[PDB]
Amino acid sequence: DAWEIPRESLRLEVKLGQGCFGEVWMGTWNGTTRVAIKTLKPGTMSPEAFLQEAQVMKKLRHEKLVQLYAVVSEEPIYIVTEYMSKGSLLDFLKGEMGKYLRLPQLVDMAAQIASGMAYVERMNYVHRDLRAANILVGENLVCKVADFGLARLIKFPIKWTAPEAALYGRFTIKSDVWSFGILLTELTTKGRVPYPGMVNREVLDQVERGYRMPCPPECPESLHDLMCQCWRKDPEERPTFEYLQAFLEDYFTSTEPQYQPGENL
């Protein structure tokens, strides 16, 4: 392969999380580098189905994509990745530090995710499962995209899934923009479940009848405005990630040059 390494390169130090597939560890690679190590619990899934999850990431490379370092294809199988010390975005939003986050940071976080998604866009891929849960956070609020979902446009959580993909499997990049729309809501509500007081089955129907989530508390109206743009029933006229990155990156130099630090935002 050449993305391959020997087990000795690696030292597994602190366990980070679990799952059906196995485990994730923080470790050192060549005694010099912090890495995250994804592990196959033997018999759960197949080495192929596992190591397939890292295929895509051999081709892609981007500052705002969680990068791939190396694999270990042997009997305890390993994928080796960059270390995002703060874990998942969603968990983070809900935590001690999640509650102290003010709008500019929240916006800039979105900008960073948008920056990565924009790259995915240039490259003709599709992420398919976009939500704070599948976003990783590093030190200093750095946010990246990860090792879940992406085929090239060559199991969905309903609430995040654009109607045409949920109904026809029309998973496109515009479908991802729609999800980015819902993602925005998580960002600005400290991680609440979108469409509160609505069950999954109900949600798709409501959305079909034109329903869209209201502007959240203390979220600017220009922001919620951007969201609805992402939620345009018509794929073709949803914004592009290039514009999203741009919009957010310039939010304060254009859309709201007079931001007043609210109580929660």
Pairing label, strands 125-126, 151-152: antiparallel
* 236 binds other proteins per the rule CB under 8 A: yes
Is 22 annotated to bind ligand?
A: yes
Binding mask 94-133 for other proteins (x = CB under 8 A): ---------------------------xx-----------
* Residue 245 beta carbon to other proteins: minimum distance, rounded to whole angstroms: 10
Site stretch for other proteins (CB under 8 A), options 1-9, 53-61, 64-72, 237-245: 237-245
Cβ-in-10-Å burial (0-12, 13-18, 19+) of 144 comes to buried
End-to-end CA distance of the chain: 49
How do the residues of the chain divide into helix, strand and coil, expressed in percent and rounded to 5?
40, 20, 45
> Of 108, 129, 225, 250, which residue is the catalytic one?
129
Is 138 annotated to bind ligand?
A: no
Is 50 annotated to bind ligand?
A: no
Cβ 100 vs Cβ 118: under 8 Å: no
Residue from 28, 33, 73, 240 binding other proteins (CB under 8 A): 240
* Residue 230 beta carbon to other proteins: minimum distance, rounded to whole angstroms: 11
* 253 binds other proteins per the rule CB under 8 A: yes
Number of continuous H segments (helices) and E segments (strands) in the chain: 10, 10
Is 17 annotated to bind ligand?
A: yes
Residue 225 annotated to the active site: no
Q: Indicate the DSSP class of residue 4.
A: B
Is 38 annotated to bind ligand?
A: yes
Cβ 229 vs Cβ 239: under 8 Å: yes
Is 93 annotated to bind ligand?
A: no
Residue from 144, 238, 248, 265 binding other proteins (CB under 8 A): 238
Helix residue spans in 67-102 (DSSP H): 89-94
* Residue 246 beta carbon to other proteins: minimum distance, rounded to whole angstroms: 5
- Token readout for 150 is 């992406």
Tokens 């750095």 belong to residue: 142
* 250 binds other proteins per the rule CB under 8 A: yes
Site stretch for other proteins (CB under 8 A), options 2-10, 72-80, 180-188, 236-244: 236-244
- Token readout for 17 is 């999380």
Residue from 243, 256, 259, 264 binding other proteins (CB under 8 A): 243
Closest CA to 117 of 102, 133, 129, 101: 129
Separation between Cα atoms, residue 140 and residue 241, nearest integer Å: 23
* Residue 114 beta carbon to other proteins: minimum distance, rounded to whole angstroms: 13
Separation between Cα atoms, residue 190 and residue 187, nearest integer Å: 6
By three-state DSSP, how is residue 25 classified?
strand
* 249 binds other proteins per the rule CB under 8 A: yes
Report the residue number, 27 or 181, with the smaller CB distance to other proteins: 181
Q: Indicate the annotated binding residues.
A: 16-24, 38
Residues placed in the known binding site for ATP: 16-24, 38
Tell me which residues touch other proteins (CB under 8 A).
Answer: 121-122, 236-240, 242-243, 246, 249-250, 253-254, 257
